[model samples]
Target: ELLPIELDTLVGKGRFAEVYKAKLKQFETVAVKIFPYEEYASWKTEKDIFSDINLKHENILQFLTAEERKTELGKQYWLITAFHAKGNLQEYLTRHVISWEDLRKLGSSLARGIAHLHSDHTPCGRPKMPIVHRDLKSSNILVKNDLTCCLCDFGLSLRLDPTLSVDDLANQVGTARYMAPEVLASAMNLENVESFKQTDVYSMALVLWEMTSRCNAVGEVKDYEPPFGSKVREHPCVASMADNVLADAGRPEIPSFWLNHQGIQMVCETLTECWDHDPEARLTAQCVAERFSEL
Candidate 1:
């Protein structure tokens, strides 16, 4: 007997399409990501990058299958991934306050996932692909019942191949709110995509602030002055490391008030190093994780 996957309900939605939960032959559930029929480029890119990585880590949602179909927009495909009942980190955070242990687990898991992506050797025996996940907000991280985090939604991913500079890839991509100093300053003739990793570190720091504080660091900071508006007025009190690239080159203050004093200090220190106005001064994810472990 073949397994049956019942398309039950919509779990999430993105700019491209919606995601649904379904069951497989062994009563296993999956998250089905739907894409527009004409988005062949997106489909191929996502499949290639994800396939190259080879999923199934404790911190990664397993990619089970891909099915193609003819739809109104054209030829479309569905990406089936593991379904976690706890949903994404954002929802999880909303419902519960994380303990010190929970924060450590979440932080450690995120570090491991990034380390795996950064270290996995390629087919040619080279090191891992230089792929920077431009987006690293709480919503992009999924959680299991046990609180293990899985990195997802690589829609803004950029490859650092031999032909392109890091600046070439990130100067135009990523969320402005979580952007590194260079990201905000790119409009002012700044050319340093290699510095994007700095932004990534800053984003990770923002997440740490979220886990420990149980408040929206990126969203609540600066009294709801949207990213663009903040950039325009040149506010400087509570900018994240990436915010340095733009007009406000400083750490946000709200995170410090919400989390533990010691933990807040650690996070602030790490974020400062990552969001340094000088890209060379920022710490890498490995370096940051190492520091976190020591603490």
Candidate 2:
């Protein structure tokens, strides 16, 4: 279930993953993601603030180890992790419409992963700083075979240290459509670290919206669309989202039919709470995971 910079073969050379295939001790298969030397800032910073540097949870991608290797070009980084063949949530949804059971699996596991990151304590009782996964869009998450959601791509994540100044924290590091109203306004309560977590909650709601929209439980499922739909471009810019997200305060539409199911109504309510305009008012990832239990 792990690898080093060592690779048996380059499994993929695609944009989302420069994944290399390798087997461990001739027992388990693992994956290695290669990062360009030019991306030392993004890659090294991710390794530097790995959120306690011992982060491990079933809902999160298992980060085994990282290696810095020299190449003729310069230097490259390798991140070895547990491999899931199903790939990412975005592309997976585009291909298959999932059952209601699948939604619960994906949504709850997704919430649990975020909850673990935001948590300041281990499963047992140990202290750790909260980690804000600044980029929480669908592509950043992996889709396990059982339709379980696993949080991945911590390249833009941040570890909150109360001692640091607001300027040291990241105000904007997420996709445009996923950015919160306050984030789009370029105004944040830098005094409190929860402000950053609030943005993640907002994006989490959007990711769930994507999942729910594709749910067959809705009775009529449409083509998989990212949150905000046609209100913004396929690849939205901050400016494109500003007028809608900041000024008009528009979120993705929840079809009335989805409300027919008591289960989905609960989801819609959770989504509304999680994506509330007031950052502090949004449900915490822990609370959202608790809500999933209600389902």
Candidate 3:
């Protein structure tokens, strides 16, 4: 076997690792994720999670090989996976203003992925490891050339023990900008972690809203990132009162484009409710996903 493979290009890099495009004679081109041994812990965690994915999930990063190799800095982990030429969803959406149908297609891809992890129950009366994607933001999701998006970055994922409250699980994790009210509030000692589950729903609503209301998560008009501010500690939950609806969001009056659509409004209302300071006031992710399916 060759001791070193010549790299033609550096595809991607991060604080912990660098991804290079390389190939071996026997194998085709592959994206090699080289991890600095200094980040050894994270490298091992990623490897463990990647190993557990037994199905061919469209949104997942496909793994080809894993090995340890000698490098100038010392021994590092080389994780070889399929090369995605299209890059992540953010870049794709930034370059292309999608049709509503295309947006829904992206939503469905995400819904399918989340559903598989949360609801696809295994045998033995015990669920397959319940994976809670602590960070469910847009940037972390990858879109392949074919337009399929897979959830990535399980380094922050938590295995949910259904018997325990999800709020407890979400306590101090997730990004501040994208985090649920409970998550943020919990950090400030204002709320509990059990409420974070609903925050996930709220975030999903914002995500769908972004797809429908141009590129902005809060629509093209407002500066509110979540589109819903804490009206009485957050914006009103308009969807819950509107008879469980999907894609029924109302778009706000933006300086540009058409009148605020009902679909955009619904998404905003739903998200508003999700972060409604009151945990009891929020809807569940499962319900939200089902509602969006009808849109």
Candidate 2 overall lDDT versus native: 0.82
Q: Please report, in order, the local distance difference test score of every candidate based on alpha carbons.
A: 0.63, 0.82, 0.57
- What tens digits encode model 2's per-residue C-alpha lDDT throughout 1-295? 2232347777554333477777766467788778887676766766665534547788888776777878886877877778888888988899999888999999999999999988899888789777888888887788988889988777777777767765577436668888999998988888788888899999999999998899999888989888877787888899889889889888999979899988888989998999988998999999999999988
Model 3, 195-217: lDDT tens per residue? Answer: 43555555565565555545443
Off by over 4 Å in 2: 1-17, 21-27, 49-54
Sequence-dependent TM-score of model 2 = 0.91
C-alpha lDDT (0 to 100) for residue 211 of candidate 3: 51
TM-score of each: 0.77, 0.91, 0.69
**Winner on lDDT (1 vs 3):** 1
Candidate 1 local lDDT, 244-287, one digit each (tens): 54455555444435444566567566756765666677677778
TM-score of 3: 0.69
Clashes by residue pair, model 2: none
Total backbone collisions for each predicted model: 9, 0, 21
lDDT, model 3, position 104: 58
lDDT of 1 at 25: 64
